[PDB]
């Protein structure tokens, strides 16, 4: 299926004592591969996935210098955004930044990203056209013009449409045994009594990868998309994912309902009943 590479940056200010805690993580699809942490002992770009360890020291030295560059850019962004919004210095604040690119099944560019947030609220984001920005409040309009005067979006289109796609293709090829696998979900279903005149049926899906899965209930034979509960896909702790879906069924009619699982690791979508 489609693939993506995302880089996440977070610098939280420790008011008074303590320099800003800076964390930088790189992702391919759902798994992290690189990580930097100010509180870590290495002070370098540490590996987090097996396949990137093919890269030599020239890679790790160049990436480490670039992370420490982003560490200072965001250390100034904290002071710049604290003064624009006119805020106290005894209070902590959080700047977040994400840029990356998506590709389809044919590994061709789909869309790129370059977004920013202050304390978890959308600050400025690169639009779909990779040209204009999305600024809501005036402190983001100040940054919008500042990035328009410096031609930021024009300088990033080279990275988003090319450099990002090239490295993602190398990552998908060096780690094809990890990033291109499809573990089929091991499925089962349970029936627990909720009360009289009703009872629930929980459709499970375990030990699958990637996290993209579709679990819909069907009551002979239409979807019950409204009155159904669907937990967020969660990590199992061993690289796979878990998810379930449940419906409340009046007693004696559990056999009329049926669950349907759709996943990349399944040649045809499965179907289970009581």
């Amino acid at each position: 299926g489609s693939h993506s590479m995302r880089y996440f940056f977070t610098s939280v200010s420790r008011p008074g004592r303590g320099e800003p805690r800076f964390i930088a993580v790189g992702y391919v699809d759902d798994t992290q591969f690189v990580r930097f942490d100010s509180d870590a002992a290495s002070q370098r770009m540490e590996p987090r996935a097996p396949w990137i360890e093919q890269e030599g020291p020239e890679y790790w030295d160049g990436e480490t210098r670039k992370v420490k560059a982003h560490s200072q850019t965001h250390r100034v962004d904290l002071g710049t955004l604290r003064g624009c919004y006119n805020q106290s210095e005894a209070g902590s604040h959080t700047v977040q930044r994400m840029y990356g690119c998506d590709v389809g099944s044919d590994w061709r560019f789909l869309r790129g990203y370059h977004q920013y947030a202050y304390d978890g609220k959308d600050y400025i984001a690169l639009k779909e056209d990779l040209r204009s920005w999305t600024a809501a409040d005036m402190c983001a309009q100040t940054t919008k013009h500042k990035w328009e005067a410096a031609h930021v979006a024009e300088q990033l289109r080279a990275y988003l449409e090319g450099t990002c796609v090239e490295w993602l293709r190398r990552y998908l090829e060096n780690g094809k045994e990890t990033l291109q696998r499809t573990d089929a979900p091991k499925t089962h279903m349970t029936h627990h009594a909720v009360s009289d005149h009703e009872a629930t049926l929980r459709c499970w899906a375990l030990s699958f990868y990637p996290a993209e899965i579709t679990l819909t209930w069907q009551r002979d034979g239409e979807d019950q998309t409204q009155d159904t509960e669907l937990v967020e896909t969660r990590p199992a702790g061993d690289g796979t994912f878990q998810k379930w879906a449940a419906v409340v069924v009046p007693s004696g009619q559990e056999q009329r309902y049926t669950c349907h699982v759709q996943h990349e690791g399944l040649p045809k979508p499965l179907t289970l009943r009581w």
Binding site: V12, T94, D119, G120, E232, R234, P235, Q242
Partner: protein, 100 residues
């Protein structure tokens, strides 16, 4: 500022079977800011060998991470997860259901 209360899920790595070794997971996600305190409980008392994954967040700017320990599920003992956050005036506890 504008904050989100963390979402808590308590579950096991493998389907729970009494007597057989397993891993107990507590997955906190969708919160802000990132400072959070997560504990795993065995009949109330805190487990001391609590590992946790690295701090992460999705493109919606909300953080997530996973805590996990080794445990052997049984019929009598009750496990839970105590999470304390800035958005919680008092600690929030989510007990572990075997089929959830």
């Amino acid at each position: 500022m504008i904050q989100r209360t963390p979402k808590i899920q308590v579950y096991s790595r493998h389907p729970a079977e009494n007597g057989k070794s397993n891993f107990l997971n507590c997955y906190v996600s969708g919160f802000h800011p990132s400072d959070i305190e997560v504990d795993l409980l065995k009949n109330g008392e805190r487990i001391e060998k609590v590992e946790h994954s690295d701090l992460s967040f999705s493109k919606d700017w909300s953080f997530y991470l996973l805590y996990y320990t080794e445990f052997t599920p049984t019929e009598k003992d009750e496990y839970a997860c105590r999470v304390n956050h800035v958005t919680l005036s008092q600690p929030k506890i989510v007990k572990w259901d075997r089929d959830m």
